[PDB]
Each structure stands twice: as C-alpha cells, then as structure tokens.
Structure 1
Amino acid sequence: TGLLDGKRILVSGIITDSSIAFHIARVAQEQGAQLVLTGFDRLRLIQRITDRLPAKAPLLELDVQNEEHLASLAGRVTEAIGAGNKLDGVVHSIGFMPQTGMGINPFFDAPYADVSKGIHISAYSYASMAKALLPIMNPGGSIVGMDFDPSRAMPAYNWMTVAKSALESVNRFVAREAGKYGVRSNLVAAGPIRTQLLEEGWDQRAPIGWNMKDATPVAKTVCALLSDWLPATTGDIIYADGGAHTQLL
C-alpha cells in the first residue's frame, strides 16, 4: 500500500549508487512503482548498479544526444512494460557540463562547443524525452526533472547554472505540450548533494538544515510529484533545498 502502487515509471540518470536517480528509483520501488530504467554509455556498469535496487527493473540504453535512441525509445519502453500498457511517470535526472564550463575554469574560457553539449544534455533533452514519451503516457501522468536554483549567479557552477536557467524555461513549454495529454511537467530544485563555502552556507540558510550526504528527502519530493497528491501543479518548480532559497542569512 505505497504512494505509487501500480504506477509504471521511467527513471533516467543512474550512473552510481550515489546518483539522485538511484535514490528516486529506490524510494519509488519501496512505494510500489514498477520501473523502467535508462542509462547512458556504461550500460554493463549501470546494470550492476541497478542490481543494488530492491526490485529487478529493465534497463534501456538512452544517449539523449542520439536521435536514433530517441526515435526508438517509446517502442523499446512498450516492449519492456508490455503492449497495451503506458507510463504514468517519467523522471529526467540527467545533467552534464564539460570541465571548461563548470569548476575552476574562468566563465569566459568555456568554448561554445562545450557549452552547447552541456545545454543539449541538461536542458534541451528534457523536451526530447517528453516528445518521445508523451505518446505512451496515461492521463494524470507526471514528468519530473532535476533543477539547481539558477535565479542568482554563484562561483564555479558557471555554465551549468546557465543550462539550469534554460531547463526551467524548457519545463514551462513542456507543460504546455504535456497538458494536451493530461500530463503534468515539473522540476525539483534540490540543494547540493555529494553524487565548500557555497555548499556549507546551505545548511546555515536552511531553516530545517541541509544534509548534502542524504539524497532521500530529494527522492521523496520527486515521488510526491509522481503521485496523485499534487494534481494541480504544472510548469512549476518544487524546492527540496531545506528552504535555503527563502533565506538571505
């Protein structure tokens, strides 16, 4: 008798057992969901990580930069869940920015080819995934993506912050399309998770604190959006950040 009992949910973005997607998948299975997982490049490695989950789930390859992977995705999901069955949820937990665009590298030294790759994977793909999967989603369905509050600039995050600002915009347009299918589209803006000064300021600002080593409160928030309990929320952002973004000091 779980929160997601009988729901068929696709979860992308598992690479390690510290991945936010790994925790989303674990909580969803604990809550009765039947999962379909997608992984990128290191599929044998990802399959071994998926063996750590409480229940067995099919693993499909999905490189969001590969248009053939996207064109075949719905058919491959249908084969995994069975003909006549549709998805109730989709989790986009994919992000990438080359070292030139995120870290110590000066903001101005990131070449556009690197930034474009990062934007393709971190923002445009949220629209690609919705385009591929909306034709196989049930009404009352839910699409959830992962965000990192980009409303204010900050050190090091640089072009990944720019990619998240683009993602938030993409999410609002995806909600317009998803609405035609009776499907919601939302992002969960998480605080920093270990998957230093800027990061420690989070626990200080958060009225309920913030534990960077614990992805479970973020996974629970994603599951709340996948459930039938936020039925009037779409094109929106839910902050699972300890309330840090609501406080200056």
Structure 2
Amino acid sequence: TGLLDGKRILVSGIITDSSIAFHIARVAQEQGAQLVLTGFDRLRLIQRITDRLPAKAPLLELDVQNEEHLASLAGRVTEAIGAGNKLDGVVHSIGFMPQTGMGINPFFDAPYADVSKGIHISAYSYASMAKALLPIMNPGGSIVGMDFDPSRAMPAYNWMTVAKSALESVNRFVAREAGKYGVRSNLVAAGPIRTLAMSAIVGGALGEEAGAQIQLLEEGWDQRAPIGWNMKDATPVAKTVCALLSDWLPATTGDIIYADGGAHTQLL
C-alpha cells in the first residue's frame, strides 16, 4: 500500500549518495516502486553507491550526449523489466555546465562550445530521454525533471540559469508529445540542496565570491520560506517527485511544481 505500489520507474542522475536522484530512488522504493537506474560514465562507482538503496535495481549506462546509447535505451530497459512490461515513470535528474559557464568566471567569457555542452546535457536531453522512452511508457505515466527557478538572474549561476530557462520551455513541448501517449511531463523546482559539489563551491571551488554568494542565497532562502528550508535534507524534494509519479496529480502537465519551502512566493 505504498504510493507507487506496482509502478515501474526509470531513475537517472545518481552519481553519489548526496545526489538528489539517490533520494528520489530511495523514497520511490520505500513506496513500492520497482526501479531501473541509469548512470553516466563511472558505472562501478554508481553500482557501489546504489547497493545502499533499500532494494536491488538494474543499472544501465546512459550518456545523454551519446546517440547510440539513446537509440538502444528502450530495448535495454525492456530487457531489464521483461518483455510485455512498460514503464510508469521516468525521472530526469541530470545537469551539467562547464566551469567557464558558472562561478566567478565572467558571464561574457564563456565560449559557446562550453555553453552548448551545458545546454545539451541540462535541457535538450529532457527531450532526448522522452523521445527514447515514451514508446515504452504506459498511459497514466509520468515524466519528471529537476529545475532550479531561473525566472530571475542571480550571481554565479550564470549560464546554468540560461540552461534551466531552456529546460522549462522544453518541458512544455515534451508535454505536447507525451500527451499523445496519455503521459504527463512536469518539472520540480527545488530549493538549494547541499550536495557534494555545492559544498565544494561554498568552499571556493568556482572562486571565493561565488562561494560567498551561494551562502547568502542559502541563508536568504530559509529566511524567505514560510515553512523554512533545510538545504541538508533532500527528502521533501524526493517526496514531491514521487507525488508527481503517483496517480494523485492526474491533471497537471507542462508545468512546474515548486518544492522550495515557498520561498519563490515571498520577496523578503
């Protein structure tokens, strides 16, 4: 009697135990889902990480910039879940921007080759993955991607902000395509989560000013959030993704659900 009992769900984006996708996978399994995981490049690492999940789940390789991986993905998923079975859910939890595109590196100095690679991985791939998986998704199914509200500019996030603006637009078009299959497509806009890399940025990995700016953003976020915001706790975000994967938001698509403590609704 879990929220996702019987559902077959693909989850991308695990790379460490602090990955938002690790917590999405954990909560989905606690609620009865059967998972297929996808991982990029370091598959030995990812397998060792996902051994800590509450249940076993097959791990498939997927580099979203690799056309061969995308073309073979549905077949590999079907092999893993059994002929005649389809997916009920897909989680896109993938993002990347080269360091020239973030941090104290000036906005104008990011070469377009770098920005293009960030937009490929962070925005276009939401459409790539939907293209690959919709043919093996059931009616009533759900595609969910992770967003960070890009409606306003901010220090340091720079071209990643642009990539998220693109992703939000991509999501509204994926909803048009997915609708033909009876499938919903939505994003969860999360507040800041202190992953490994974010702690590295606070420690100055992308420059001192950038670290300082992110600490100020984190502090302000919890202040503005009427119910507070705990950057060390991804569980509320994971629960929100599972809500979208369930049968309980059946008339929402092309849309963005804010799991951010309510901060974006408050000026100060």
TM-score norm. by structure 2 comes to: 0.93
With 6-15 and 99-108 compared, the bigger mean Cα shift is at: 99-108
Q: Which runs of 4+ in 1 moved over 2 A?
A: none
Q: Write the distance in 1 (CA, Å) between the matches of 2:102 and 2:264.
A: 21
CA positional deviation for 1:199: 1.6
Q: Write the distance in 1 (CA, Å) between the matches of 2:259 and 2:145.
A: 13
Question: Which segments of 5 or more consecutive residues in structure 2 lack a partner in the other structure?
Answer: 196-214
Residue matched to 2:66: 66
Q: Write the distance in 2 (CA, Å) between the matches of 1:221 and 1:24.
A: 9
1:160-175 counterparts in 2 under 5 A?
Answer: 160-175=160-175
The CA deviation string for residues 197-228 of structure 1, in whole angstroms up to 9 with x for no partner, is: 01211000100000000000000000000000
The CA deviation string for residues 76-104 of structure 1, in whole angstroms up to 9 with x for no partner, is: 00000000000000000000001000111
CA positional deviation for 1:21: 0.1
Question: Which segments of 5 or more consecutive residues in structure 1 lack a partner in the other structure?
Answer: none
**Other structure's SS at 2:100 match:** coil
CA positional deviation for 1:26: 0.1
Q: Write the distance in 2 (CA, Å) between the matches of 1:197 and 1:106.
A: 20
Query: Structure 1 residue 235 and structure 2 residue 254: aligned?
Result: yes
Residue matched to 1:14: 14
Q: Write the distance in 2 (CA, Å) between the matches of 1:208 and 1:199.
A: 14
The CA deviation string for residues 125-177 of structure 1, in whole angstroms up to 9 with x for no partner, is: 00000000000000000000000000000000000000000000000000000
- The alignment covers a number of residue pairs equal to 249
Q: Write the distance in 1 (CA, Å) between the matches of 2:243 and 2:37.
A: 19
Q: 1:207 aligns with which of 222, 226, 244?
A: 226
1:1-249 counterparts in 2 under 5 A?
Answer: 1-195=1-195, 196-249=215-268
Q: Write the distance in 2 (CA, Å) between the matches of 1:57 and 1:94.
A: 19
The CA deviation string for residues 91-121 of structure 1, in whole angstroms up to 9 with x for no partner, is: 0000000100011111111110110000000
Q: Write the distance in 1 (CA, Å) between the matches of 2:90 and 2:103.
A: 30
Q: Write the distance in 1 (CA, Å) between the matches of 2:45 and 2:106.
A: 33
**Other structure's SS at 1:44 match:** helix
Q: Write the distance in 1 (CA, Å) between the matches of 2:194 and 2:129.
A: 26
With 129-138 and 102-111 compared, the bigger mean Cα shift is at: 102-111
CA RMSD of aligned residues (A): 0.3
**Other structure's SS at 1:124 match:** helix
Q: Write the distance in 2 (CA, Å) between the matches of 1:40 and 1:103.
A: 24
CA positional deviation for 1:73: 0.2
**Other structure's SS at 1:100 match:** helix
Residue matched to 2:203: none
CA positional deviation for 1:53: 0.2
With 104-113 and 162-171 compared, the bigger mean Cα shift is at: 104-113
The CA deviation string for residues 39-75 of structure 1, in whole angstroms up to 9 with x for no partner, is: 0000000000010100000000000000000000000
CA positional deviation for 1:191: 0.2
